[PDB]
């Protein structure tokens, strides 16, 4: 994707006016510096390769982390899947109105030892399970629930000490593109909820210890990483200025357009 | 001349004598839905002269301390003729538009407006916990107006109308990435924008989804000397283009 | 049993690798594609669109629409300055938050020419002439019109065409410059001065305004993608 190179320019005295235009048309000026001054011929070898939509977006970003403890009944984690709880991936995806990509999940699971009272605690490696429940399926209410059979729900088992687990998810959507903004309601009566939460029905993700609780408790944490692949993007959009406040909507408290200086001529 | 247009749609004509060019969309012109991209199976209706014509909205007064106005416009034409009657009897509908904002003044006045058409403009609420109600977001064929101050957080269901954040929590100078024009009273007299159908689905319900928003914001305020005409109005006429409807039922 | 030997870098998670991974939902049938208008393929065509710059950062105009309005009056002294700022497109708070300066804050290096368009939003009976200069570094900022005419300049005559483009060129020792404020890769200063006066008739207001726009030329380029310093978090958004 090589950029354009400048051509050699000469002194002109003519009726052609490349500098004078009309910005009221909604059209930006297509001038190069060889129209307003005398230039030399350079040949540029610079590329626009690292600014593509694929190169800008296809990096792994943390979206959530959840904890769960061994020595407890109902010690297991859940997460309703969205991309609107972190500050950095939310601002990158919201430069465009519509997106369409494949995913690449990666989980980073760690553990910590909790203050037991037995002498000589010695535990084996821990095995974890991460089950995905699509909207409508049965959810687990405890750790030794029947719902962890995973006859049709996809899950993954992983033992501590190895490489992190990793799957690949296609473009799952009802519509033709993922929507980052939605100016509308759920009900036809225009009551109730409003905004992007009406279109978020991606499912839930459950996490547990497969091992039994032996002699001391163990608290585990799992971090979730998203990576968009095969990206298409439509209708660009100005980047977010104010800080984010909530997850379900675009509420903000107002802020100035830049920071201030002391004068108009100060440098 | 490059400063004259004439736009004919249905039984209506718009003439202008000072203008910039017309801005067409993202480069594409409004057309009908093809057989490759359709999903609904029954036959659409296409009236195409009873609905595709210029409807003129209410006029607003450009005062000296004005901040801006907005319309939504699937909703602004919900009571306008046989366009608004086809929206009531049908479940789906898709359409493109052509928007003609017009504002004249003499050679002795000054000012500048930004006329931008944004898709999927989620507005923000003044209270950070709620979402705004419907009557705060849009009135039918009547403008909702920005403010040069901040709405307090004691207002439960109200739109945050601080104009420099454009209602969306964003830079108001960066709104020139959507299709836009300027009305500079020194040079210009009207702005014309031709918008295609932009959505993520091939058809949509026209009553619970506004997929456009027209904003008119004075970047340079109105000013004149004593003796000149103090009343300067702004008028907006919108004509649908290539409109069709599926899912005929009762009237709602 | 084919004999293999695992190298360093095994069982690591580098967040910018390109490997194949097994699909969790096999033989899933995706929704067919649609033609949506306005497909963006490269971020360098977002940065090539004009956006208004807030030159008037004066400690109470930033939370207002007065940040974008450059005041211009009918003077009585010759060669007065209008504005002036250093050309740091991602470090100076004039060009920091624009549509070009917001893209530069995701990257580390930048290279190319920069357009600056100025629109005269005054009365139709007002005349005037301005000087739009650009000074490469090495000396200070120009303090006179005589110092500023020695650099790259254009002389703008207002009239029917209400806009004028000052195109600053790429004059640099290195192929790239740093987005962050570095003294080794300084870029210079952009100033504006009165050439002649703003002359208005009777019953016309003598105070006008100018809007300024910025974009990138067709040889602009960015490099070394990083994270923006503008967004921030303490707890989870919920």
């Amino acid at each position, epitope marked *: 994707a090589r950029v354009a190179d400048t051509i050699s320019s000469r002194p002109t005295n003519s009726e052609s006016i490349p500098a004078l235009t009309a910005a009221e048309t909604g059209h930006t000026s297509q001038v190069v510096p060889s129209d307003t001054m005398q230039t030399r011929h350079v040949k540029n070898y610079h590329s626009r390769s690292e600014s593509s939509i694929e190169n800008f977006l296809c990096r792994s970003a943390c979206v959530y982390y959840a904890t769960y403890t061994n020595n407890s009944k109902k010690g297991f984690a859940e997460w309703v899947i969205n991309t609107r709880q972190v500050a950095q991936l939310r601002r990158k995806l919201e430069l465009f109105t519509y997106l369409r990509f494949d995913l690449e999940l990666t989980f980073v699971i760690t553990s910590a030892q*909790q*203050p037991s009272t037995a002498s000589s605690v010695d535990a084996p490696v821990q095995t974890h399970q991460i089950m995905y429940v699509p909207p409508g399926g049965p959810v687990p209410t405890k750790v030794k629930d029947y719902a962890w059979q995973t006859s049709t729900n996809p899950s993954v088992f992983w033992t501590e000490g190895n490489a992190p687990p990793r799957m690949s998810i296609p473009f799952i959507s009802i519509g033709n593109a993922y929507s980052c903004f939605y100016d509308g309601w759920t009900q036809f009566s225009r009551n109730g909820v409003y905004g992007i939460n009406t279109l978020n029905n991606m499912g839930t993700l459950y996490m547990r210890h497969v091992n039994e609780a032996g002699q001391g408790p163990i*608290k585990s944490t799992v971090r979730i990483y998203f990576k968009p692949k095969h990206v298409k993007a439509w209708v660009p959009r100005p980047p977010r200025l104010c*800080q*984010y*406040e*909530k997850q379900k909507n675009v*509420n903000f*408290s*107002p*802020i*100035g357009v830049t*920071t*201030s200086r002391t004068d108009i001529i100060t440098t | 001349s490059d400063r004259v247009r004439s736009i004919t749609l249905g039984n209506s004509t718009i003439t202008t004598q000072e203008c910039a060019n017309v801005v067409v969309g993202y480069g594409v012109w409004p057309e009908y839905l093809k057989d490759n991209e359709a999903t609904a199976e029954d036959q659409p209706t296409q009236p195409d002269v009873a609905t595709c014509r210029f409807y003129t909205l209410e006029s607003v007064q450009w005062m000296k301390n004005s901040a801006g106005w907005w319309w939504k416009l699937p909703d602004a034409l919900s009571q306008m003729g046989l366009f608004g009657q086809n929206m009531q009897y049908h479940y789906l509908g898709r359409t493109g538009y052509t928007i003609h904002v017009q504002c004249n003044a003499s050679k002795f006045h000054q000012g500048c407006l930004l006329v931008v058409c944004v898709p999927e403009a989620e507005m923000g609420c003044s*209270n*950070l*916990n709620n979402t705004p109600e419907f009557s705060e977001l849009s009135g039918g064929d009547s403008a909702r107006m920005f403010t040069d*101050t*901040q709405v*307090g*957080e*004691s207002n*439960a269901k109200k739109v945050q109308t601080a104009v420099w954040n454009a209602g969306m929590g964003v830079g108001v100078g960066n709104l020139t990435i959507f299709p836009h024009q300027w009305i500079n009273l020194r040079t210009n007299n009207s702005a014309t924008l031709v918008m295609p159908y932009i959505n993520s689905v091939p058809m949509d319900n026209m009553f619970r989804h506004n997929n456009l928003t027209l904003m008119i914001i004075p970047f340079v305020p109105l000013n004149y000397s004593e003796g000149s005409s103090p009343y300067v109005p702004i008028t907006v006429t919108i004509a649908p283009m290539c409109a069709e409807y599926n899912g005929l039922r009762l009237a709602s | 049993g084919l004999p293999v030997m695992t190298t360093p870098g095994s069982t690591q998670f580098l967040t910018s690798d390109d490997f194949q991974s097994p699909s969790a939902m096999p033989q899933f049938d995706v929704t067919p594609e649609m033609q949506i208008p306005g497909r963006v393929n490269n971020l360098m065509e977002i940065a090539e669109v004009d956006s208004v710059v807030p030159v008037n950062n004066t*400690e*109470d105009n*930033v*939370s207002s629409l007065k940040a974008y309005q450059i005041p211009v009056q009918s003077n009585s002294d010759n060669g007065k300055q209008v504005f002036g700022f250093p050309l740091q497109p991602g470090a100076n708070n004039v060009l920091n938050r624009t549509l070009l300066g917001e893209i530069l804050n995701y990257y580390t290096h930048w290279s190319g020419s920069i357009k600056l368009t100025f629109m005269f939003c005054g009365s139709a009976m007002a005349t005037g002439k301005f000087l739009l200069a650009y000074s490469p570094p090495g000396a200070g900022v120009p303090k006179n019109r005589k110092d500023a005419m020695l650099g790259t300049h254009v002389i703008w005559d207002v009239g029917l065409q209400s806009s004028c483009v000052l195109c600053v060129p790429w004059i640099s020792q290195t192929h790239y410059r740093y987005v962050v404020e570095d003294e080794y890769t300084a870029a210079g200063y952009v100033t504006c001065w009165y050439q002649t006066n703003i002359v208005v008739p009777a019953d016309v207001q003598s105070s006008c305004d100018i809007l300024c726009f910025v974009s990138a030329c067709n040889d602009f380029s960015v490099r070394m993608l990083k994270d923006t310093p503008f967004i*921030r978090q*303490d*707890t*989870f*958004y*919920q």
Partner: antibody
Amino acid sequence: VQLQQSAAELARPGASVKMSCKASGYTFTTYTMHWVKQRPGQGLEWIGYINPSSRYTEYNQKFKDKTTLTADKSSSTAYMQLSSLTFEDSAVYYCARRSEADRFVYWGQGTLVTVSA
Amino acid sequence: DIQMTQTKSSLSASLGDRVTISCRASQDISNYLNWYQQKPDGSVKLLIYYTSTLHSGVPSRFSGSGSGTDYSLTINSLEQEDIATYFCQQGNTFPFTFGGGTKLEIRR
């Protein structure tokens, strides 16, 4: 990354008094600055806030006619002025910085105000 | 206003025991509750910024629970650095209202 307040102050009934809360470690004009009152026999009590970017203040209904919030971007402090002091207005006043929607992550150390003669 | 009430105002237990502080709202605040801890020298810090989500740097003895109107805070192993005053705060309605205090002490 901390917030630093003024020292303890003492005023006559009917007089006025002005606190301060100097912020450091972050950009002062990005977050609002809230003020909380704690009388020693009761719980905490919200007073109001100020947006340092636009100098916009909003108050509680009990504290609207007395308190006056102000700020300055240069020294990056936030002041608070109590006027027409009574014996009820003797408490410990905190400054807090609000993040997200309803969360105060960073607090001050508090200034003690006593109204006597 | 939504009145938050903690009916205890004083609680006593031995070290190594499990304590439970409860805060009750006026109407439904919909899981927008926060818990703060005021040390005896006057410093306040945020512990749990939702019904049950711990702030960073907080030890894992602390745990939050509840739904609707009635809520809870649990310290499952009381230490000497946990003797303080604890406040609840709703974030649902203007203005922000804090609950009364609840002070901890030693049983004997």
